[PDB]
Design a binder for this molecule. Structure first.
Ligand SMILES: [Zn+2]
Ligand SMILES: [Zn+2]
Ligand SMILES: [Zn+2]
Ligand SMILES: [Zn+2]
Lengths: 507, 7
């Protein structure tokens, strides 16, 4: 039996650079063609990958010492050094890089002072000792820090490759040097290609565990086509939603898996948009969304209504084991929507503009979700026109970064199992704060390191919802058909979704 | 990480 498969993806690859990759498709690819110090296991816990063991923690929980294993290698056969990591991380925090991942490094001493421009990037409290030892100093004890070290943003990059390619690093398949279970062997255009192939990396330190010779990927935007290909043996998986999920729900090859992933309506609150600057308008939008109808009828695939910004089944209190997301903080209420809208009309000039644009990805169900929301908003906010604008993923990312939007159907999947993975995105000058929400009291609640941290973060979530700085819609369930012959693929509800390292084909 | 697509 040939060890090959063709799997699916939701968008083209957007980045091949750890420093700049922030979307799920790019991150899944990087999790499979590259590797970091730690890699998540089947329980979403960081286990030693390039690192030879868990960190040795000293200095009252603030100093982490990590040893790189003997035989950890780049695809060109050269050793991965501690210095590769030092330079890689300096590169992420360097303001010249303009990395969307800079906030992930905030725990490390001087990362804040580098962000303000008070200090140079060489002050980042990370150093090599010899070629194989890393020492890191944190500002304070940070229980999830080993989890951060498993993220693609913390992956090394090869110093030689970075020196060679400079600003063109990651421009194409030829301008990277990787170190993972697979090599990227076919990818024509970053940002545009609907197909790519990865192949077993024989220079990978743990190549003995890898069975697949190659894995092909195909972007699927139209579910009917994915299913038809799947049934003809032209795809080994097919994504499902709506009527398609309804019909395949009882199939032996069907599964649905709940993700730590909230889809939002992000709202431009910089002042450019006069409607979304008004708090009553934002609250009207929130109350107008019939989340249960969306998930039952439109998605119908194990997705669930949002109860807050933070999704369910992600983070549990160490002391009492309670889910963080244990309060119903948002809920459909048509009459309150109508009333908040009537209140807003008294405060704004409707002559100027009574219209809101909604950006969505141009895939089948993203467009359909946008149209569902359009009808909900138009039905409860009398006189409001909502336009839906489906666009390609690379254009969508750029417009979010530039705040060239009004409303946006976009979401976040937790990178690690703590509420702060979500809540940090709404901090005043966070790169992921696309809407420009700013509440200084929210910012401060996020900094709590006391025995009451859990409670303080919940207060922050409530302040965000009370201001209605972002509208949570639904928590994503991933439904699909998958051929029975596919074995041992690791699927994660947090971080990079798929790990194909130990994948194999049986019968 | 950012999710522009959910199916
Ligand atoms: Zn192994
Ligand atoms: Zn269709
Ligand atoms: Zn149903
Ligand atoms: Zn539960």
């Amino acid at each position: 039996v040939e060890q090959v498969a063709t799997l699916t993806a939701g968008t083209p690859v957007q980045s091949l650079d750890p420093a700049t990759a922030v979307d799920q498709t790019s991150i899944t690819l990087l999790a499979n063609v590259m590797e970091g110090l730690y890699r998540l296991d089947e329980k979403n816990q960081p286990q030693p990958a390039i690192a030879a063991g868990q960190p040795k923690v000293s200095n009252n929980g603030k100093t982490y010492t990590i040893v790189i294993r003997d035989g950890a290698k780049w695809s060109d056969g050269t050793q991965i050094t501690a210095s590769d990591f030092v330079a890689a991380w300096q590169r992420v925090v360097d303001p010249k890089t303009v990395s969307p991942n800079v906030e992930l490094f905030s725990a490390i001493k001087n990362a804040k002072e580098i962000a303000s421009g008070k200090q140079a990037k060489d002050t980042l409290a990370v150093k090599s000792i010899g070629e194989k030892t890393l020492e890191i100093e944190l500002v304070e004890p940070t229980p999830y820090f080993t989890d951060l070290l498993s993220l693609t943003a913390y992956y090394p990059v090869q110093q030689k490759a970075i020196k060679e390619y400079g600003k063109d690093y990651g421009v194409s398949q030829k301008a990277i040097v990787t170190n993972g279970a697979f090599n990227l062997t076919n990818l024509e255009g970053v940002g545009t290609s609907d197909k790519w192939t990865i192949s077993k990396n024989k220079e990978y330190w743990d190549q003995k565990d890898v069975s697949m010779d190659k894995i092909n990927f195909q972007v699927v935007k139209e579910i009917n086509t994915g299913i038809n290909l799947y049934n003809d043996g032209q795809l080994d998986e097919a994504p499902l939603a709506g009527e398609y999920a309804k019909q395949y729900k009882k199939d032996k090859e069907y599964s649905t898996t709940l993700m730590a992933n909230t889809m939002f309506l992000e709202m431009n609150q910089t002042g450019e948009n006069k409607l979304l600057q008004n708090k009553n308008v934002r609250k009207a939008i929130n109350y107008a969304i019939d989340r249960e109808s969306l998930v039952k009828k439109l998605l119908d695939n194990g997705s669930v209504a949002s109860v807050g910004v933070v999704p369910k089944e992600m983070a549990f209190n160490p002391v009492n084991k309670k889910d963080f997301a244990n309060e119903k903080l948002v809920e459909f209420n048509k009459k309150q929507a109508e009333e908040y809208w009537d209140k807003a009309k008294k405060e704004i000039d409707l002559s100027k503009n009574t219209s809101l644009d909604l950006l969505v990805s141009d895939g089948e169900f993203e467009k359909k979700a946008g149209e569902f929301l359009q009808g909900q908003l138009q039905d409860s906010l009398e006189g409001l026109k909502v336009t839906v604008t489906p666009i390609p993923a690379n254009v969508f990312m750029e417009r979010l970064t530039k705040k060239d939007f009004t409303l946006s159907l976009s979401g976040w999947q937790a990178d690690y199992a703590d509420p702060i993975s979500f809540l940090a995105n709404f901090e005043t000058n966070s790169p992921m704060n696309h809407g420009g929400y700013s509440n200084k009291n929210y910012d401060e609640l996020l900094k709590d390191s006391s025995s009451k941290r859990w409670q303080e973060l919940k207060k922050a979530e409530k302040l965000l919802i009370n201001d209605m700085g972002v509208v949570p819609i639904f928590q994503v369930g991933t439904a699909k058909l998958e051929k029975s012959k596919i074995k041992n693929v690791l699927m994660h509800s947090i971080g990079a979704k798929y790990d194909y390292k130990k994948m194999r084909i049986e019968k | 990480l950012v999710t522009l697509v959910f199916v």
